[PDB]
Amino acid sequence: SGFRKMAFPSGKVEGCMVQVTCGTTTLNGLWLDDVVYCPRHVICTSEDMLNPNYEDLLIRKSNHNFLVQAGNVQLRVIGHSMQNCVLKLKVDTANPKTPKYKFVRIQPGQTFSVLACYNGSPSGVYQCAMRPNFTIKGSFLNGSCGSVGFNIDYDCVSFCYMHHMELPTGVHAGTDLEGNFYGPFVDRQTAQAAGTDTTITVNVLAWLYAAVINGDRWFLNRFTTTLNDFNLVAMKYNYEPLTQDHVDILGPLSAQTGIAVLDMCASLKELLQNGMNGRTILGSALLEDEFTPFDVVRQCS
């Protein structure tokens, strides 16, 4: 019983966090086997933030310009290279704490855990979702760059996010672990701003199933809807279209609760049109969209 924003246990990722310093710039890196990954803007000088040519900046560096510290131990850099917007620092020691891992890029609407770090030291763990506009609503302060996002499945860490910047609205942008940005953001000074966002409909429906599994039933009704008629309502309320694949993915939660997916859609339509009339679902007075169907199944009975 209960339903919380739950992250994956962070220990396997804690043992990978290091501090990378270049000049007077310090941020976090990720140490896997004998490579340390970090945002390439660690080599950016405050003099040309407008259009850094990173190829130029990096050719002017040697290995000894990179200070890597794992706890109280300094790691000798023996190679450096750029991959898209990430730097790869080869070190002379393989991390003995390297978990089984993968680099996976996630979709908008999928969730992951973030281990926020400062000066290579982990400070907290929380759950986040990739928004439809490829930002994340994180919690990060200055120096958090290089903190990572990840999911864990049977002892294997799938890294999906490395933090690079805060946008003007206070939301966050970064890359996958191959250095490729999520969304149109760039690691150079621009008035870049998050494009218009939408609500993740399949996740709101998953969360309504969580609520029914946990005994919140007040929002149910005897009605059904067609997919097409529901999607006309979704569009009006800035919700993403619900696809037949989404309906199929919600199949197990449907079967467990005995509520057809299009019957739940009729409830969501009524909540969008009427509001909640001062009631709450799973302790929230708004419709929550940062739990996937997988998240609900993992957490709920």
Ligand X SMILES: *CC(=O)N1CCN(c2nc(NC)nc(N[C@@H](CCO)c3ccccc3Cl)n2)C[C@H]1C(=O)NCCC(N)=O
Binding site for ligand X (CB under 6 A): 27, 41, 44, 49, 142-145, 163-166, 187-190, 192
Say which entry of its own copies, ligand X, none residue 165 contacts (CB below 5 to 8 A, set by partner kind). Answer: ligand X
Say which entry of ligand X, its own copies, none residue 124 contacts (CB below 5 to 8 A, set by partner kind). Answer: its own copies
Q: Which is nearer to ligand X, 166 or 216 (CB)?
A: 166
Kindly list the residues in this chain that would bind its own copies in the complex (CB under 8 A): 1-12, 14-15, 115-116, 122-126, 128, 137-142, 166, 170-172, 214-215, 280, 283-286, 298-299, 301
Say which entry of ligand X, its own copies, none residue 170 contacts (CB below 5 to 8 A, set by partner kind). Answer: its own copies
Catalytic option among 38, 41, 160, 300: 41
Q: Whose CA is closest to 121, among 10, 25, 257?
A: 10
Q: Which is nearer to its own copies, 43 or 289 (CB)?
A: 289
Strand partners, 18: 29
Whole-angstrom Cα distance, residue 11 to residue 100?
13
Longest distance between any two alpha carbons in the chain, whole Å:
69
Output the smallest distance, CB 4 to its own copies, in A.
4
Output the smallest distance, CB 149 to its own copies, in A.
13
Q: Which long-range contacts (CB under 8 A, 24 or more apart) does 163-169 make?
A: 163/39, 163/114, 163/138, 164/39, 164/41, 164/85, 166/140, 167/135, 167/192, 167/193, 167/194, 168/193, 169/193, 169/194
Output the smallest distance, CB 142 to ligand X, in A.
5
Whole-angstrom Cα distance, residue 252 to residue 291?
15
Determine the 3-state secondary structure of 245 from DSSP.
Answer: helix
Output the smallest distance, CB 127 to its own copies, in A.
8
41 is catalytic: yes
Say which entry of its own copies, ligand X, none residue 49 contacts (CB below 5 to 8 A, set by partner kind). Answer: ligand X
145 is catalytic: yes
Q: Which is nearer to its own copies, 43 or 148 (CB)?
A: 148
Say which entry of ligand X, its own copies, none residue 40 contacts (CB below 5 to 8 A, set by partner kind). Answer: none
Burial class (CB in 10 A: 0-12, 13-18, 19+), 131: buried
Catalytic option among 22, 38, 128, 145: 145
Residue 193: partners with Cβ closer than 8 Å, 6 or more residues away: 167, 168, 169
Active-site residue numbers? 41, 145
